[PDB]
């Protein structure tokens, strides 16, 4: 759920700024 | 009171006992409760009917009707020995009230459809022929509308109407009631409802199921009233001129055809009716709207959003684009045979020389007669509807609701008007050239607006995004308080470089 529901859209929104959301989720 | 200028409305619901979570089938499970609700606000003649009623099957032991009467004590309840007599009583009630609309929630696999299936399959009784106002299949009907066709009366499926009206996830009675009427309704499974309905004792359970279905029936009227669906549809029908059924059952081209035939019949015009083959073999559309890929980034500074008001209607009004105004494509003009959409024709001898000045060539290459020689009919229709809409909006509780309904109907008609053209498939009177001209001149107007905005040196702004009629101009570090003045200035500048109906509005800003 986390990955395949939140990583794609948050990555689309925040890669414009230049940050990777997946790195934040990896630490948990 | 005053004269009757509305439509009577009646709603019906059914409770059927299930058999261990089987979603009661209309072939094995019989009808038991026909709770019905009649709209009181729009019902004239002040007849003693109480606007509400409950019908319950009771074979008749000697305590069930008495217990039901005391537990309700407000609405009269009728008991019948068999469901056939109850159906006959329902038919008599319908013939007595004679409502204009019979409605309900999900009427296909439920109350109205359930009753119809029960009457046809089990009792071999044609209830449809008996509920009509005359004594003596529809795949599209069941696709996005109500598939039941009763002569004289209109069948309205409430869930489809709300789906078309309001956009939200899921479509149930509880969700609609909560998101529209702010009412939370407990939901019980069919097994539990059967269990309470089959309990001889525990009057509380009978009252519970009775109030359950009574609320289900009553909330339908409020749902259709708060959205004002009936009045809005009636106003739209009065405006367009089509009957109440065609308001929601027919497509968008029907209304445009109605306006066109009504307007042209007064000008002795004869409308061409091409066949399907002629439409299929016509020239394909070549002009496409201008959309630019935005710079994908985060914009700190204020972002002014500009949007043309009725770009295509204003284009057709200003540039006089119509079926009656096309002379022909400027290239390959022959005196023997030509081609314009789905029709072929030949120009007169000295037509071009006579009107060498009072014409306007389209961006696509089609010659259009100027307003000085012939005013186009579509321009007349669009300017009339736009003037009416702005007049009622400028004037703007009952009068306010009527004005809002008229505004919505006029907006819908204006939006659907352009869709009559460019109907390459399933089009009854299309014109590829006219649609191509409209789209191309819209693109040219957009490009001119962008160039005008970018040219100004005092406005160090750059357009970042673009749509059919949307402009996104960026003002890097421009203290948004004054950004409104800049936006108004550019809107006025763009407006003053276009014909009269073309207009640009600022209307918002994104900091």
């Amino acid at each position: 759920y986390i990955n395949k529901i939140l990583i794609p859209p948050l990555d689309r929104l925040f890669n414009l700024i230049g940050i990777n959301v997946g790195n934040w989720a990896q630490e948990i | 009171s005053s004269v009757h200028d509305s439509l009577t409305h009646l709603t019906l619901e059914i409770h059927a006992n299930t058999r261990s979570d089987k979603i009661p089938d209309p072939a094995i499970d019989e009808v038991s409760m026909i709770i019905w609700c009649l709209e009181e606000e729009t019902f004239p003649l002040d007849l003693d009917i109480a606007y509400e009623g409950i019908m319950i099957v009771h074979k008749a032991d000697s305590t069930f009707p008495t217990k039901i009467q005391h537990c309700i004590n407000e609405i009269p309840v009728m008991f019948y020995e068999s469901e056939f007599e109850m159906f006959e009583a329902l038919t008599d009630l319908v013939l007595l009230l004679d409502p204009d609309i019979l409605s309900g929630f999900e009427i296909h696999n439920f109350s109205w459809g359930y009753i119809i299936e029960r009457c046809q399959k089990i009792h071999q009784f044609d209830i449809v022929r008996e509920l009509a106002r005359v004594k003596c299949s529809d795949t599209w009907g069941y696709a996005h509308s109500s598939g039941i066709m009763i002569t004289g009366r209109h069948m309205i499926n409430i869930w489809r109407a709300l789906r078309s009206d309001v956009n939200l996830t899921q479509y149930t009675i509880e969700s609609a009631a909560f998101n529209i009427l702010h009412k939370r309704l407990p939901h019980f499974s069919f097994e539990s409802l059967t269990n309470m309905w089959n309990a001889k004792k525990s009057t509380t359970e009978l009252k519970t199921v009775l109030n359950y279905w009574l609320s289900r029936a009553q909330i339908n009227i409020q749902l259709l009233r708060k959205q004002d669906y009936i009045a809005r549809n009636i106003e739209q029908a009065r405006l367009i001129g089509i009957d109440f059924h065609s308001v929601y059952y027919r497509g968008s081209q029907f209304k445009v055809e109605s306006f066109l035939i009504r307007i042209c019949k007064s000008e002795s015009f004869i409308l061409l009716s091409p066949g399907k083959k002629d439409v299929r073999k016509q020239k394909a559309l070549e002009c496409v709207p201008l959309v630019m890929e935005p710079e994908s980034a985060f914009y700190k500074s204020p972002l002014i959003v500009l949007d043309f008001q009725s770009l295509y209607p204003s284009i057709m009004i200003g540039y006089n684009y119509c079926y009656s105004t096309m002379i022909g494509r400027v290239r390959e003009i022959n005196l023997t045979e030509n081609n314009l959409g789905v029709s072929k024709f030949s120009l007169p001898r000295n037509i071009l020389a006579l009107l060498k000045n009072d014409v306007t060539i389209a961006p696509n290459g089609v010659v259009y007669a100027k307003t000085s020689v012939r005013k186009s009919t579509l321009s007349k229709m669009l300017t009339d509807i736009l003037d009416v809409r702005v007049m009622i909006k400028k004037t703007m509780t009952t009068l306010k609701r009527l004005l809002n309904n008229k505004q919505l109907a006029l907006k819908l008609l204006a939006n659907v008007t352009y869709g009559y053209t460019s109907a390459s498939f399933s089009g009854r009177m299309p014109c590829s050239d006219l649609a191509d001209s409209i789209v191309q001149t819209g693109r040219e107007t957009l490009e001119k607006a962008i160039d005008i905005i970018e040219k100004d040196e005092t406005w160090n702004a750059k357009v970042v995004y673009g749509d059919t009629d949307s402009l996104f101009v960026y003002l890097p570090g421009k203290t948004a308080i004054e950004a409104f003045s800049i936006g108004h200035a550019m809107a006025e500048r763009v407006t003053q470089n276009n014909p009269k109906p073309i207009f640009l509005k600022f209307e918002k800003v994104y900091h």
Binding site: - | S62, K67, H70, C71, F178
Partner: protein, 97 residues
């Protein structure tokens, strides 16, 4: 309950039915700690009352009179109402057991 019909005294045994609506403070307290509690005041205002019935597995009858008014009652309590039917399905109360 359906056998008490006539101009003669009679007595029957059944539970007492009352309204017993919740107090607004309790409703506010439970709403503020539910995260999704609806407007429960609508559940009491939609009905929009002041009457007592007698349920004995066969129906209910309205307990009119004065002896039944001067006694606090809670739903689910069974009693021995002894009264007389006067003009309707409403039962008078003379003595309580």
């Amino acid at each position: 309950v359906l056998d008490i019909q006539g101009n003669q005294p009679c007595w029957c045994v059944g539970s007492i039915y009352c309204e017993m609506k919740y107090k607004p403070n309790v409703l506010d307290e439970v709403i503020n700690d539910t995260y999704g509690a609806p407007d429960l005041t609508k559940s009491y205002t939609d009905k929009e009352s002041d009457e007592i019935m007698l349920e004995d597995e066969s129906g209910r009858v309205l307990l009119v009179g004065d002896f039944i008014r001067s006694t606090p009652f809670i739903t689910g309590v069974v009693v021995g109402i002894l009264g007389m039917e006067a003009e309707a399905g409403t039962f008078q109360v003379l003595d309580i057991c």
